[PDB]
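Notes continue from the previous slide.

Worked example: a multi-chain complex. Inputs as given:
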Amino acid sequence: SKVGGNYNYLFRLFRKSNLKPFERDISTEIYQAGSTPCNGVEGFNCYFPLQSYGFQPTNGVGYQPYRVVVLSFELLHAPATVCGP
Amino acid sequence: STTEDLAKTFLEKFNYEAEELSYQNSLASWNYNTNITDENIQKMNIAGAKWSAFYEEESQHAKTYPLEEIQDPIIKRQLRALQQSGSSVLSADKRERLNTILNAMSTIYSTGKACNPNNPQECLLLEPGLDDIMENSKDYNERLWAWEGWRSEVGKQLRPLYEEYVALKNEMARANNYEDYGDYWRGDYEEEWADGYNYSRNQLIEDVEHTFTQIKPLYEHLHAYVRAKLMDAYPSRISPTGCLPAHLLGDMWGRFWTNLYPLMVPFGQKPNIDVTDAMVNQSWDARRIFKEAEKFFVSVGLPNMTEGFWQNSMLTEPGDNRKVVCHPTAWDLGKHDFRIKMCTKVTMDDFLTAHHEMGHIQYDMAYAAQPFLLRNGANEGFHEAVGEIMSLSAATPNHLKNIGLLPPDFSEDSETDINFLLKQALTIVGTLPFTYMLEKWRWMVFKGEIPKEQWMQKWWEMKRDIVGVVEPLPHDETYCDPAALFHVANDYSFIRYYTRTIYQFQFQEALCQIAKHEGPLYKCDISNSREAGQKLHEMLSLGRSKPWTFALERVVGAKTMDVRPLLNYFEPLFTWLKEQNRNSFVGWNTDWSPYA
């Protein structure tokens, strides 16, 4: 939480179908959904897919950032990599 | 995509854009009233212009999207909130007339000052001398000089453009794209809608009449008290039954009747509970005062302030070299950073009205999960009504002893308590009448029904015998009695006070009816009582999931006004009123021609 603020986190907006676990799409073409094809004219349902966060130092209790870390495991007959004392 | 769907995409983006830029302008206002320099003024102006330009390009976008093939109610609510638009086409001439006239009176009102007719040496601005008089002075030539000098000095600089603006008021209130500007001063409440809950200005005016007919007498006695203190301070002028001559008004235009309080004593032993020296002597500590705010909402479950709240939330005036106004403005910076901008010191304002500020914070969190169009108080009328409730309920020795600081065998002095009931009734019922008169005129001139001739005769013949006004010097047809006030130039609709008054009035009926009073509306307390705690606090905290009518009904009952607890005030105050000053009476006036 820096005094000026941080505007450097961003997510997806538009898509056609739902994804599968552990899957990723990277297409960044102008999103079009009008019958008239979108030649590349901004507006008329053609926009920029990403959208920034806009964080600030004095955010609220519910909006203060949290660093999420996931320690996932795969449970099969695969070779083990866990030990102890 | 349908029009609904493309606009929903554009919605999914502008929600985020709006929160971002609204927060930015929120810190802009923070720097507005936390420090004041010329660069700061320019910065707030440019930020406001930038967000206004964003809103205007959004408006032009909204004009493009149609609505006819849309079949979604709540999505349509959000869509209408998006699609509000307009006002970028007016020509130079007419735009100049309207907006230039308004801004011109605004600027001269800001940059004007007055002087004296008889001793022009001790001549001073609107604030110091005149408000000095109405707060502390009791001299006849002083008050008379105030009124006459202000009139004969400010009307002369306001009138001619304002007569051309009588004509201009007619034209623009008829032309400005809506039904009328009387009902646009009533326009944030203006209705042409459906879905079952049709209550409107017809019932409004009819219960105005019925409100007179039932609960006018206490306002009678309150007028008696204030106007009588003045008439005693300047004795031997007037007959009792009729109205009063007015070279002794006591204020500028009669906004409040609070301006005329102290001296008269039919309600006359000692004044209401004042605790400056009490705080000096025993000092029930204010930290534990906010702790009992916590406790009397922890019997219902509410938290406290934080260190960041201590740092940011500013309640007093800065008091330093900063040139800022001490006007208290309820605030929120958004992003769950609910802060405040009042002029609040350690007083009854602190205890009760800061239960109400900390409740601004808690209430914001109560609707912190709302979507974009609903992050605000369910009503600003709720704020004032429940502020009155909180003041009159937590200003209580029974609460102070339930936290264990006062004994529980307190006896009171009749006449003093009686003064306190005096003042409370004064505010509560003295709100409406003169503003009712000007709003009748404004309604039907902004609809165009008054011809350009009957104005002033109508004013006098609605100044001595129908319902009540008073004004000394003859405001002939050239002057603009229809409009001569900076607040009318500032679109601060007063009558919304009375609208929320009747709303909250019967709301209190239903709410403390569920709370089960024995008699009247006060003593509807909460402290250290768990069952009442849920049954009023989860009661008052619902949300905004449905339309406004559904929300208000489900929350707080019926759609009328009180008589039962005000009647159980009256009859007991009737008996007490007897036992001290048994000679109360009746009357309200409006049909005059006094000085002529």
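Summary box: Chain A touches chain B through 15 residues (CB under 8 Å). The radius of gyration of chain A is 20 Å.
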